[PDB]
Amino acid sequence: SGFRKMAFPSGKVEGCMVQVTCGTTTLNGLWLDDVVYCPRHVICPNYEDLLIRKSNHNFLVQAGNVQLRVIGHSMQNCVLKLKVDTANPKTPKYKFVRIQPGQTFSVLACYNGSPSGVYQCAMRPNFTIKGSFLNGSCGSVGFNIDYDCVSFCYMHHMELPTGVHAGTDLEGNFYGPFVDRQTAQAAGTDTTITVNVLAWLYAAVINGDRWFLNRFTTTLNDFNLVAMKYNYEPLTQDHVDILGPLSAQTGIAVLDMCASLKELLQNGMNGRTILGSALLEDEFTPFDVVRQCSGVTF
Amino acid sequence: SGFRKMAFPSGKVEGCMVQVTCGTTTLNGLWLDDVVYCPRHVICTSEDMLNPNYEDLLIRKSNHNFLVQAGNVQLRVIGHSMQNCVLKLKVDTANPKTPKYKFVRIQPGQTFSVLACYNGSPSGVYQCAMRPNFTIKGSFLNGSCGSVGFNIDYDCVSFCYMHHMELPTGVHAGTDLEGNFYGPFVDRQTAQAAGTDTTITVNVLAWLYAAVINGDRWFLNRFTTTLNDFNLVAMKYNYEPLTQDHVDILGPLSAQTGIAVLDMCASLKELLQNGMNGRTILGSALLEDEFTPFDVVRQCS
């Protein structure tokens, strides 16, 4: 029993964190094999022009108390790839994956190439992450672990004026309509990840919280009209299919749980909580609920 | 900006997790140097848990009855001893991944990270707090026993908790790494219940200071309170008494934000009275009590 916001064990990623310095800018880099990946704003904009003026020795890369020597550099989208002489002996089995909004991942927040914390978060529908980052956190990475393989899905680049964060996948493509530069940028109006709220309601039923259940059902269309009214993301047939296992385990059909969600949106919680929360939680995917309510290890 | 429930990076602890098997029971062990620490109930059967005599069960065991597995390598047990509710298995190999560590016993209100493990394999990491009733609201399934709680201070891992059992309300009980249980719990399947839980007041105040640091001031008011009046009000909401020690501990946050501790206490009193009125504080519709004054200073600054 118990339901916590759980991150993946960060050890495989900790062994990859390095500090990258260029001029007066210090941020984090991800050292995988003989390449260090970091935000291209470390050189700061005309990034081709700024980069051409740099020599290999202008980039100081530090792995613990060991200085790595940069032997090459190239830019791929908004990510700088520093070719180093030494391959990381701690390189885990890894993939670079691009995630979709609603998907969750763990973030190993780092400062000066030293990991300081790990937390779980979701890529919001507005492509921002509600993270916890301070100055020097740039280059901190987001990941999932699938068996023994680390799938790197996010690299921190910046903080928006509302306190939310923006970044890229490990191929340097931003999530969201953001650019890497000091300019007027704002996160779009955010929405609630409906499939994730439903997954969390199934997690509550599994942990013995059933007060929100009712005898009612709904059509997908009627639920989607109600959900659009409350800034909830549309629920697709794919989401319904994905919630199939949880529906079979608890005995509550997805559209039956949708009817519970409609009642909570229309009437609130009435002084009650669900899994110790007075708000509907949307940062647990159906897979996170299954993994935590089954004990999958890495 | 941002305020998340953040766990310590678990890597230093992952390299210590092993699987300990005794007969039909499999749970987790913590391999530090040449010793594997695990709950002593690993030697118990299910029909032993009611009134187990651990000294009698342990004397009947030899080293080869304990199977210890670190990854795909079987460690050889060369000795065993019991210290309170933990079994210490002497092994023939020192853990090369042994970090710099300490065994620390924590007080209620303290937070720590939990590396939840099954079969000596880490599955997740989350942040926890020792509740005033000495239980932890964790997330553990069967096979999680032996999973550990820790804090990392610089390069040193302070092990503060080892999971032993789940109580009937879904909460968890365990020991420090010297085998002393937190609270009035025993490693017996006897009728045990967590005492009435209370809110960690000093932690809620710390989290209100974290909200002020991140720009949320809507809950502040023009009032102050005496420490006694605050405690009279707090006790009616099942909040832990706030001591002069807690007030002293909140000094740095009070100096940083410019809001006196008893002035923040007055906002808390008002929040308890009014609720949040559809508003949130740091993305929460409830008053958060699992961030200490030390956690707030570490994460906000």
Ligand SMILES: O=C(Cc1cccc(Cl)c1)Nc1cnccc1C(F)(F)F
């Ligand atoms: O409580 C237990 C085993 C147990 C029983 C009675 C007394 C002791 Cl000291 C230990 N396991 C457990 C732990 N943590 C979470 C769940 C579980 C579960 F029960 F489900 F297996």
Ligand SMILES: [Cl-]
């Ligand atoms: Cl303590």
